[PDB]
């Protein structure tokens, strides 16, 4: 408290004494990484008194070793440089040496000018002639990392923690890799609305807002799917979209209210093609980052066990209904959306201590059974395939299997990474399934979507046979970076 | 008329007869562009009966020239191919020829199999043996182009110029990311859902997170989060994404738009002007091959002007240019009641519509809009905005009451807003207080105080330059469109 108040006072004094107060521009000669590249291999004790250079960074250390000599460490752009300030080299036009230095504190952003080289002891250094206080720190900084501070004051985390800074660099590398993959395949990158008069395209509860001048509610998108498929009607053939989607839902280690996904739509692909592309893309990215397809993961955090996740392709397929039936020891009732099957599935939830959905739709019940019996088998990347139509309103009926669709989900360690299907392109059925969804919504299903007449009209203009797909990039980055909490891979995660 | 209902009946009949009904997969041999590249300069009348290929596209034309011969055009991936369906080549296992072809209509997505080559008249063709109805069109299509915006797929299907716009849009965005990537910037993502909105003069959307029992705002800008990353030591960050406004819609405003903002440690606004020129002139040159480009300010039926991106671009000093327009000086201080009253008098004198409330900032903005933005045809910087209208901009190092800020205007439309960032927490808190006071007096564009940001500044924001570009508006100039609805796939439309 006192430190902060006092620093404010000290800065007002500087201001009133006509001393440098928040200089507008400090011209660096080079970055600290550049400085290190240039001078890092000079001989011990090397100094170039013929070269004057300006540097800047945040002060991480101050040591006055004598009345004549002050050592600083400064850090910038992942590089530390030592500053050696000797009273005999001080430019007195900037002030008396003791006055100039007395203004600086650990944590301040400062500039220095001097001669480059290396101390006798071998430390990369600048032998300074001046110091400029650029931006003071008004708080006594913790020397290294409630741990909610890391998320509510992420700048402190970034200032102190190299590991955290590497995660956000990895994130960008992964996103660039994904855009590059689609770009090179001839996909067009597009942007479709995040504000929708009618939400759709996922099993999700939306955020609701209002546009005053247009006099309408708008929803924040839960997915770009319905717009993207209109682009395939439009003849663009191969589109993708990489950006934010939203969920008005609870938060946990794998769920934030906004997340980054990539979805693509490819004319003439079916879900078998999509499985192959998924394997290719994700195994590629894993290899790019890790140099093989078998990678470490710490499911319980860095002090817990280390397992190995094996991305060798092809991946296991589990058939949705068959794996539930294997778990139950008996068959689901047919049709799967009958009252007989609903009742059987409720009975099985009691028998197996599975928490019921609300409302008890056939789709929701199927999902809870899959959660318990099938997603739990998905340790290494595994596809869960052939989802019932009743839970898959936008997925095309299976060419072989009654009541099923051409759908998959990718799971890694029981977490959903992808959702994809041969797209439903038949408008009569699509409208019927939308009606069923609106019915479910009306019955209290907060994840069911309203009918979208604009989409049905688009289907009436002819959607080519198409395959579509989505990937939760944050969740993938958790595996790539070895983090078990979504808050580690988002700069500013949601907090209760 | 009954065309849609009839098509539904046709499809039901097909389904009930066991005939092909929405096949799941059609395996093409090659794309239509690849087909054209391979066979496009065979000899007239060339046919290779030894090669059977499968091709697919949308039917753009049908001519049943006789009982025995039907000509189709199909279109896919920017390439048209002619199909010649002769009864003598028809595979009867797929049905009788008349039955098979009776199912096809203009606009349908179809597949064909057949032999490659060229008609006697020299048209690249497939000599087909079968046809598969993949996805019917239930509507009679216009032969050529509000419908373009409400049913964008029709525009895309029929209008090459519309497809070109969205390709150019992607090229431009890729160019931008590349520009910052090569300079060593880190691309980041910061929250679109904010507990406390800020960083622009704008009314936000408001929503609610049920589980966390909290009101949220949709962002109007990323600026306050981005600056925290520079406090964090990331040094160079950029963010290219959507921002939101709960405001009116017009030819240059949609309720969501795409902007890029960057934050560069150690830059001032002079550095940012230089970067602006280099990025934008470079992108213009890339797309147009000149720095002088055509524009149709009143649409394609109006006149054509030239916009000149040659550097150095014009600078106008905000207050000096107002005073040149007035033929008299503003009162000082600029935020005094005396100057507010004087600016109201000047608005009345010059028939400038008054803002509400009549704050010093709003009045200055109205004056600039009348006297200064109207001078900005070619790319021009308006510089050195008053502090009272610039709560996040650092005080001018020379000019009392001003800041180190610029806006870029093209044809009087705002493209960029940028400044030497305020990094001094005492003043920053005071300016936020003034904004909250404006809000309380009725200013629907003023933002509430963000304590979290002020506390970040107390940890030491290096001297920094920050900047934002409205990408859509830039694309309007690059693609020569005067309506924002032309450069967004799915623009907002009145009910
Ligand atoms: C961090 C985070 N938060 C959420 N809330 C998510 C979500 F709800 C999801 F449905 C979700 N599914 C993926 C499969 C296809 C689209 C993306 C996610 F990857 C989520 N990722
Ligand atoms: C299509 C569209 N619609 C809007 N509503 C815009 C807006 F409000 C704006 F403030 C705005 N300023 C730009 C200058 C810096 C940030 C972006 C725009 F470029 C907008 N572009
Ligand atoms: N929109 C889906 C992903 C794409 C599914 C296939 N079209 C989701 O949000 O889960
Ligand atoms: N956030 C500003 C652009 C950045 C200005 C400089 N920090 C805007 O929305 O106008």
Author numbering:
A (entry chain A): 45 to 189, 194 to 544
B (entry chain B): 45 to 189, 196 to 545
Describing publication, verbatim:
Aminoacyl-tRNA synthetases (aaRS), ubiquitous enzymes that are essential for protein translation, are considered attractive therapeutic targets in a number of infectious diseases, including malaria, tuberculosis and cryptosporidiosis. KRS1-mediated synthesis of lysyl tRNA occurs in two distinct steps. In the first step, lysine and ATP are combined to form a lysyl-5′-AMP intermediate with the concomitant release of pyrophosphate. In the second step of the reaction, the lysyl-5′-AMP intermediate is conjugated to the 3′ of the cognate tRNA.
